[PDB]
Design a protein around this ligand. Structure first.
Ligand code: 2O8
Lengths: 274, 274
């Protein structure tokens, strides 16, 4: 009942009421010597995508080098060379909606022509506002993530909701329809460990804006800060964050460990009555 | 702030505010040919206890054959022969509070003399009311679990709270102090799969009775019913139930997989601000 529309992802449709949707994380393994497109690079990407599809992923999230976790300085002409061949191949042989992980307008634009269905922006359309227009033009869902270039909060949650609505304004002024807007609390970004725990504890507040919320906490540093555990041993901590996130009404979770998280989400959904 | 007393377990003290307490499950591996006490049986019990202590367990729960999951018909004279040597050895070389898993008064009584600190009753003092007196006499914490011999609920939750308070009455009429009372929703017992999901979803209601709540969902059938997964693949489902349980204010979780659940509980505590 909570949502009265389905997420329209070109040729795939995502119901927001039946279950928590699992977005699986695919990071490029760049080939040295080449700028992209090579067989090993692309085929490792496809095999990874297929594994995630089998493990219960509903969306595949595809990131280049300029995005997380790398954040390397690459121009858009090269990032296209790399990210486009992956999107052409994955979209061809894995029938799932694909989101492009970029804050760059031209990269988002190429990705969608290559065959991406959703835009996923870590800067909430603030780094390159034209990205909002790209989304409006192609009529695709855009994920707006909370992020700032500083740590200076008067009031964390109120500041987050304010910051986010600034993103919504930019998106809607560009012509993006409400149904194509998704929000993300930006856990792990521009927050102290203490502020990350705080945002998690108060996540249900994001619900007042009236948009589906995607949660992305997978293997993040704050989990390590709490448990005192390296990145490879953060499965149980990520699981907690996913369970809490779902209890507090999130519609997507973005995770590396698709099998495990998928199982937890399904148990949560059964319990909270999704 | 929520609790203004500590759980007094003889020589160990359990703070109910700092963190979710993990009770690790130890089931006897009975030796054929002997009635109990043999070296392999007892030493496997000790090694298991030590493993759980290292994995982060705060309490060791020790069950004989007449209790779960076996429920075999054994007299109390034999159950004592088996459960007492385990309790003497574990209490000797694992410095943790030990709970005896029994609904039988004489068994509880022997267990405590042998060195058990807490009584854990799956029948909520209704099967053998004298167990309440045993607890009152020795001044030990008693866990009262919801259980009935039928499935006939007018209103699940109201019926559960009613049933439980009937247990509290029997306990207090025997002389058990409020601080020595703990409650358990009896998930997996006398409930359909649908009713188990319901009790989980409405667990916070148990809080109104004003007693610490222990949650025990580890590897239970309903998790299997939801995920469609055999008992060995229920880690992720148990994890969900533990996370939800903690969100809804439970003070203990009783689990087989101490390492994993301990990590999840610790992440939950950090998030909900315990
Ligand atoms: N490979 C495993 O047995 C394993 C270990 C830990 C986890 S984390 C959990 F259970 F989801 F919370 C999952 C699977």
């Amino acid at each position: 009942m909570k949502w009265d529309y389905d997420l329209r992802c070109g040729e795939y449709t995502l119901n927001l009421n039946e279950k928590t949707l699992i977005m699986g994380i695919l990071n490029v393994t760049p080939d040295s010597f080449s700028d992209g497109g090579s067989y090993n690079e692309v085929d490792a990407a496809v095999r990874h995508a297929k594994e995630m599809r089998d493990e219960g992923a509903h969306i595949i999230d595809i990131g280049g080098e300029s995005t997380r976790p790398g954040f390397a300085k690459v121009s858009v002409e090269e990032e296209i060379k790399r990210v486009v061949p992956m999107i052409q191949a994955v979209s061809k042989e894995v029938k799932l909606p694909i989101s492009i992980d970029t804050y760059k307008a031209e990269v988002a634009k190429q990705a969608i022509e290559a065959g991406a269905h959703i835009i996923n922006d870590i800067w909430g359309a603030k780094a390159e506002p034209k990205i909002a227009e790209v989304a409006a033009h192609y009529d695709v869902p855009i994920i707006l993530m909370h992020n700032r270039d500083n740590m200076n909060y008067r009031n964390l949650m109120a500041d987050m909701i304010a910051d986010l609505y600034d993103s919504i304004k930019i998106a809607k002024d560009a012509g993006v329809r409400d149904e194509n807007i998704i929000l993300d609390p930006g856990i792990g970004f521009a927050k102290t460990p203490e502020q990350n725990l705080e945002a998690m504890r108060n996540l249900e507040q994001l619900n007042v804006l009236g948009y589906p919320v995607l949660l992305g906490t997978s293997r993040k540093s704050f989990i390590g800060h709490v448990l005192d555990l390296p990145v490879e041993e953060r499965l149980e901590g990520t699981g907690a964050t996913v369970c809490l996130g779902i209890e507090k009404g999130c519609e997507f979770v973005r995770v590396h460990d698709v099998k495990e998280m998928s199982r937890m989400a399904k148990m949560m959904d059964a319990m909270i009555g999704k």
